Amino acid sequence: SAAYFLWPTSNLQHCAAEGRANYFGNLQKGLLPRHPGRLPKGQQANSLLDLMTIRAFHSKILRRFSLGTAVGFRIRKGDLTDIPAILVFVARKVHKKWLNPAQCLPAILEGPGGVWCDVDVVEFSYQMFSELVDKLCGSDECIGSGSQVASHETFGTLGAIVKRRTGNKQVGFLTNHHVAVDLDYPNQKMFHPLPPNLGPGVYLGAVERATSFITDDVWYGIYAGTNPETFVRADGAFIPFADDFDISTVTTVVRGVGDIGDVKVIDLQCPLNSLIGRQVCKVGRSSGHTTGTVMAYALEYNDEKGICFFTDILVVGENRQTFDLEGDSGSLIILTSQDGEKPRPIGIIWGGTANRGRLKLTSDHGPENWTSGVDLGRLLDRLELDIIITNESLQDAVQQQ
Amino acid sequence: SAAYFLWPTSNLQHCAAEGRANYFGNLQKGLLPRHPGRLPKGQQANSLLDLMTIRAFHSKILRRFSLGTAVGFRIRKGDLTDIPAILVFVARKVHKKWLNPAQCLPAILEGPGGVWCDVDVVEFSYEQMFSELVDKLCGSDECIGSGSQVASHETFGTLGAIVKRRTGNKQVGFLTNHHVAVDLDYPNQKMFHPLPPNLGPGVYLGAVERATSFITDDVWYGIYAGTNPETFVRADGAFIPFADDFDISTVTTVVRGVGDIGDVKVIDLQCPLNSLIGRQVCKVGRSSGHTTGTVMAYALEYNDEKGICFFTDILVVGENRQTFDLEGDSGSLIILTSQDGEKPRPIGIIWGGTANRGRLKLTSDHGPENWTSGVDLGRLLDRLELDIIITNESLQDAVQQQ
Amino acid sequence: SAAYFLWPTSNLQHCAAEGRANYFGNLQKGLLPRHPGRLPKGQQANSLLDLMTIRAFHSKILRRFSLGTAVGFRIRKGDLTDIPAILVFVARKVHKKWLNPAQCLPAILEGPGGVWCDVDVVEFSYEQMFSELVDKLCGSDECIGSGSQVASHETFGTLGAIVKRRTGNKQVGFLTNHHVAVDLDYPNQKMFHPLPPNLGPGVYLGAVERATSFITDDVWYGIYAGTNPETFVRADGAFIPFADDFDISTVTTVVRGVGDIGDVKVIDLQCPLNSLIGRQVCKVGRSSGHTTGTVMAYALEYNDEKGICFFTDILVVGENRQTFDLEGDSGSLIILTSQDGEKPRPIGIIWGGTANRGRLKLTSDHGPENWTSGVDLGRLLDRLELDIIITNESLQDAVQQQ
Amino acid sequence: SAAYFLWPTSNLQHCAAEGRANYFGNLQKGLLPRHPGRLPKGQQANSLLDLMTIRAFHSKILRRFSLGTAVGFRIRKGDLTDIPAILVFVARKVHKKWLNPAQCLPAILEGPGGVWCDVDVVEFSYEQMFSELVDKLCGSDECIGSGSQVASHETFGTLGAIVKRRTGNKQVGFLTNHHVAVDLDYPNQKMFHPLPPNLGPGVYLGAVERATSFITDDVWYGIYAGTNPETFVRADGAFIPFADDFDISTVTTVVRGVGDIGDVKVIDLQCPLNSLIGRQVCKVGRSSGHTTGTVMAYALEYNDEKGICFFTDILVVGENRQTFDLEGDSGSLIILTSQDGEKPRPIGIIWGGTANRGRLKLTSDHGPENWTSGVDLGRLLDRLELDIIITNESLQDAVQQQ
Numbered sequence A: 001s002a003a004y005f006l007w008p009t010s011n012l013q014h015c016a017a018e019g020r021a022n023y024f025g026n027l028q029k030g031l032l033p034r035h036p037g038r039l040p041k042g043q044q045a046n047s048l049l050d051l052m053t054i055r056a057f058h059s060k061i062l063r064r065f066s067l068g069t070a071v072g073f074r075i076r077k078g079d080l081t082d083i084p085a086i087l088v089f090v091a092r093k094v095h096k097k098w099l100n101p102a103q104c105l106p107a108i109l110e111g112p113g114g115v116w117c118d119v120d121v122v123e124f125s126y127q128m129f130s131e132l133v134d135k136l137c138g139s140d141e142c143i144g145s146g147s148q149v150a151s152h153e154t155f156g157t158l159g160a161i162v163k164r165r166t167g168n169k170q171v172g173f174l175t176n177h178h179v180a181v182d183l184d185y186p187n188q189k190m191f192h193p194l195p196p197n198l199g200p201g202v203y204l205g206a207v208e209r210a211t212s213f214i215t216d217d218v219w220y221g222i223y224a225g226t227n228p229e230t231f232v233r234a235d236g237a238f239i240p241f242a243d244d245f246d247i248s249t250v251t252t253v254v255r256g257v258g259d260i261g262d263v264k265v266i267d268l269q270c271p272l273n274s275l276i277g278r279q280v281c282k283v284g285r286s287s288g289h290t291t292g293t294v295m296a297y298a299l300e301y302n303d304e305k306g307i308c309f310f311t312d313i314l315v316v317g318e319n320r321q322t323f324d325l326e327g328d329s330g331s332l333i334i335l336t337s338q339d340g341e342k343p344r345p346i347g348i349i350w351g352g353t354a355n356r357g358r359l360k361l362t363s364d365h366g367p368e369n370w371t372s373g374v375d376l377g378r379l380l381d382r383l384e385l386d387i388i389i390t391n392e393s394l395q396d397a398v399q400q401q
Numbered sequence B, C, D: 001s002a003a004y005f006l007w008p009t010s011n012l013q014h015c016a017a018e019g020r021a022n023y024f025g026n027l028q029k030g031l032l033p034r035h036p037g038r039l040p041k042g043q044q045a046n047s048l049l050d051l052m053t054i055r056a057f058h059s060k061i062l063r064r065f066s067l068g069t070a071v072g073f074r075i076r077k078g079d080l081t082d083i084p085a086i087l088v089f090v091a092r093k094v095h096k097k098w099l100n101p102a103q104c105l106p107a108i109l110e111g112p113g114g115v116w117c118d119v120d121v122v123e124f125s126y127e128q129m130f131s132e133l134v135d136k137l138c139g140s141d142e143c144i145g146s147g148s149q150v151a152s153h154e155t156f157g158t159l160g161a162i163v164k165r166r167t168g169n170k171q172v173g174f175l176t177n178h179h180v181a182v183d184l185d186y187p188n189q190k191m192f193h194p195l196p197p198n199l200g201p202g203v204y205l206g207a208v209e210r211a212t213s214f215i216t217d218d219v220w221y222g223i224y225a226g227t228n229p230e231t232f233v234r235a236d237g238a239f240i241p242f243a244d245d246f247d248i249s250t251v252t253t254v255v256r257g258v259g260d261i262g263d264v265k266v267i268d269l270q271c272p273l274n275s276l277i278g279r280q281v282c283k284v285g286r287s288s289g290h291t292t293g294t295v296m297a298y299a300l301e302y303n304d305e306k307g308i309c310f311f312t313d314i315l316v317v318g319e320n321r322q323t324f325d326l327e328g329d330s331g332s333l334i335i336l337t338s339q340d341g342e343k344p345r346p347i348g349i350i351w352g353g354t355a356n357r358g359r360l361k362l363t364s365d366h367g368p369e370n371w372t373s374g375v376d377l378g379r380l381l382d383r384l385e386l387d388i389i390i391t392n393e394s395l396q397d398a399v400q401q402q
Ligand SMILES: Nc1ncnc2c1ncn2[C@@H]1O[C@H](COP(=O)(O)OP(=O)(O)OP(=O)(O)O)[C@@H](O)[C@H]1O
Pocket: A065, A074, A075, A076, A077, A078, A090, A092, A093, A094, A095, A096, A097, A099, A103, A104, A105, A119, A120, A121, A122
């Protein structure tokens, strides 16, 4: 019956940011530990939460000389270590001899409660033809992860087959919301592989929900920065399958990977090494199957207009090959099987913007491309979705809608 | 609390596509149309509903050789008549001698049930005012009202009317064009007057709550206005409830440069045409200030490049060969001028001007004049579930209950 | 029958190239005007041929410091005089104090046989009227005549005159500029009024038969107008014989906005200058409608850097500092206005191309006025082998005698 | 003598437009709609004429969802088969699962008289070379022959073949495609090797005499290839007879890098397909030098935006995923490579235009390959009335009999 759009209404009147100023202020007044002295080994950062609270506390001394920050492990000579650090992204990485003490970043940083960590400096900036790509783009006899989805004006990738947690518990799929956005045209109807104005295809369904920006305090549960206009890039859209659409054609398998497990949630208190440095893979309609490494979490970026933006996952492709191309947006970021458990998804690729970023890891090599991913655990929670991972579970879920 | 956007549920499958084909199919085969057209005078079109149903019946024969259509009065020698007609928009209006019989549009057309009307041909296609009023609207005035410049981080618009929601807690707020609120590149939820914090000073007006972009014709008008099953009405409107912080003492329900307005005058499709078509209208917008024009036509059909049919409710042409609006006027109130002394009533709001918004030629001596697109305010408030507040006392009363 | 294009046979390889060289070679028995500088008044230039042969003799020295040249009357203080002169076009006219004597033009020149003339220096260089006449020309009129818009799939032009071919079948058709027809991107020999089938409605007029683009000076004028052996005259003509299906009852030999015209007035190079230079002319074209102007100069020389000499027959400047033409008028008849009561006779058609958008400064008070390029109609009809039809009765006689 | 261009008289409007309609009216009357016993193998399409007649008959539904069509052999798994088929070019080739029955192209089609064929779906769409051969063609060699760069003032092209005219004095000259000859701004009738005088050194080869741009299908093929009454064949050719001064001692009838060629191999539409479709071809051009490719299809249909049907004779794809030609090769001879020791015979010349070359996908693993357009040389020489000279002795003999 409703003919209008409803905004996400996460305003939480300014107390959710009034508490932000008061949070960092009241921690600021309590400096008992005493003078510049090193810090004990027992209080070393261990979790993602630790690194994020340390970085947020010193955001403003870090922001001044930096393009951004992220949490992870220290990178020395291009190789990841297992040392909890805050990665500071500089425009150009120069020798210490050319820095004044105000500019030179420290080697250690102690946050609230004496929790300390390392500070790593990284130099920073901002089609595949295969049998797999053709299958994803409409040559296969099935629709699944990686399949090209399209509205009248935009193309995207189908991330996962999902079901809604609330109400009807409708079965559908998850993709990236910019492929479904209506300002010039109506882009509510999704099709595979092409929209009717461009060529043949099948009507998948109409967009129901979409998140674009969610404040950090809601997304992470903590204040990740001092800026009161802080948003998380939380791109995701839920499209319930059309009442006519033939569910027999959908597959819960990620083609080129196999049977995947349930979503692996990024718990901010687990030890870092379970996410940072882990090998991930992607199947998308543009680059097909690629392999990469998780370099960092919680990428801070304060932009021209004065708003802080966080990007959850930072992946760099293996062997100096780009992890993704433009158009892979929506693709599932799957943790590769280590000794034989089913590969579990941790995120989806965020829509590549114009002039995507790059970081230099070694002098011998040039700058490599990095890919930005959205936390799948948090996205499914915010969109109120459950991922369907077996073909039998799919037909069971359809029965109850 | 919700963290997501909820898309409008105007899908309505499958009688919205099945019922459209079923509606036009059953009327076409049983015709009994007895070709020699005596067309008795009692069956002449009288309402807007009559013209739209006639146009919809002959949509394909009309769209075949034309850029689009709209309903109204026949235009003869550049002047509006009182003759009910379907306006057919041609790229170039050429003499009959240069048309084959397939191309030449008829002078009369009879629809379902023998209801007939005229067919008029119109040639069709698809800088700042500096004044104290414009400065007042753009932040120099001590108050916020209709015409006041509203802004998100990335886009500027005009405040149309001060409104209150009909449902729930009946929040008081304002109506503007949803193109100011675009969450694709940047979080453009917070609205400000006159400038966003990144560009300059201002006051936080509130956060967008509702917005309509496209509503199917069968929902908006209540009838099937065309044969295309993907037919949408461009209905731009966004509701921004005032922030709790906002000083509602600074709001005025007066339309500066017009005065105290009355309640929304609803466009009833069954009333006689002469109460909308040809009536003089006025607009106060942050770009052109106060302008005056005429309502030329209703229900502008346009079957574009991708194959989707789009309807635009109101078509205004400015008086004295002057543009009725400029870019940036989108959202402004389209007010019916007082023609015997009652309070001027609003009938619509300006729709956000596309790139290369068309022109139309009326007589040979003058070139093409600019036309302005409006959204039906009666239908927009109903769809958004809004009530317009027209007196400063009523505003103080509406703000209390909440 | 023929499926190919036949390029004109005006090559005469090395019959024109050395005949030019020996003409100018066995002239050197000439120069040394020894000794004095003043020449007798009895040998003053009187014709166009006199002025052109003087310019041709001193072409090398004149082209040294100038953008081009033309023949006419000296312009002094912005007004045409009665003094036969060679107009030398400089980019920027500076005071004598800033020129070396080599750069400064002599403002008198004697050619072969002591025929002398003046040298005038002119500063030189290289959006639509809306009216009922324009609308009628562009398809609103019930007839096709001079000024009517003609079109192929990709290009628009103006119908200049209704003509009949002199040779063979003596077919009736019309004359326009060939750049509306000549196309190696597409099939555009088919002409239509007012629009081609891909753009809108219209009637098939007929197919292009012959078209001239460049004609060497020695053929066009009959003399060697310059020393460059690659010297061409811009003669844009196109003869389109009417289709057999075409209703010739719809054609009018009347120039709308001028009236009944007389026969083509031939530009005889030996006549006194004042019969062409300075005469008032008018034009009816599909873009600017009816305009009025003055013939400023003839035989405009322009040597561009690829090394080819190009001549433009007529140079018109619009009256009252108003442009004589706009883009799209190409083909329009350049009609001599009735000065005492005789029928206005046509002398040329407007040239459509690239080097037509140039300006010349006549007075300091206001800036550079626009000039329009015309092709000699007398020479064009001769080269195309056409006769102009000027009365509607003569038209139906020509149609019946095919 | 003549100072004008003569347009081709190979189009007789609406005398032949009815004959096209009548031909399809005749096929539609003797429809013979039957299919009890599936498709006997004796009635299978064998010729190019068979495939073209089937495609034209079912033209309406094929073009409904397609970018174009062509005749040849079915392509299965990226390799040409021996199955007579109609190639339907789709923008993106999707699985049967995603097509409604209206969209899905059939696997077989039987046309008039029960002659049937297959329907193959192909995905379709619409830097320099440095070598000793390229340098020799572009002016470093001591001779002028096939592949040699020819130039007018504004355009560069390739010299295709050394020819003599069949009519009149049987002038000897050369053949290239008319976009190297044709002008809009300059009198670039004169051809030069390797450069025009404005750009650098060269020798004057001669002046263009004839040029074909578009020829209707009924004239070119001898049959009605499509139902559109505005149907044209892309027929780029230009005949430049050698200047009388030109030293014919420097001309070679040899195709450098291939050798001595045989006479033109005429594309007989009634011969078995395998003599053209799938045959290996080679090309020597001033941009890519020597390249090798395969004849993929004949009679490439393309109905563009303006509503005109365009046919392209030969469709070549380069071998081993390498482009068959580059920009500038237009005019080069498309030579059939020797299959069993015969001299390689030329069958066509490369076409130069706006629709020059798009892409077609043959396999999933490696991406889309480039295709090249060729014009039927057998038909081009007939239309221009030219004979190809293939031996240096025949050249010197042809020179004397002038
Ligand atoms: N603000 C700054 N801008 C540019 N360069 C800086 C800045 N601050 C520090 N650096 C450089 O970065 C260096 C520290 O780099 P980092 O912490 O990455 O070392 P590492 O990880 O131990 O070794 P590697 O450099 O091999 O990774 C300093 O020596 C200094 O030269």
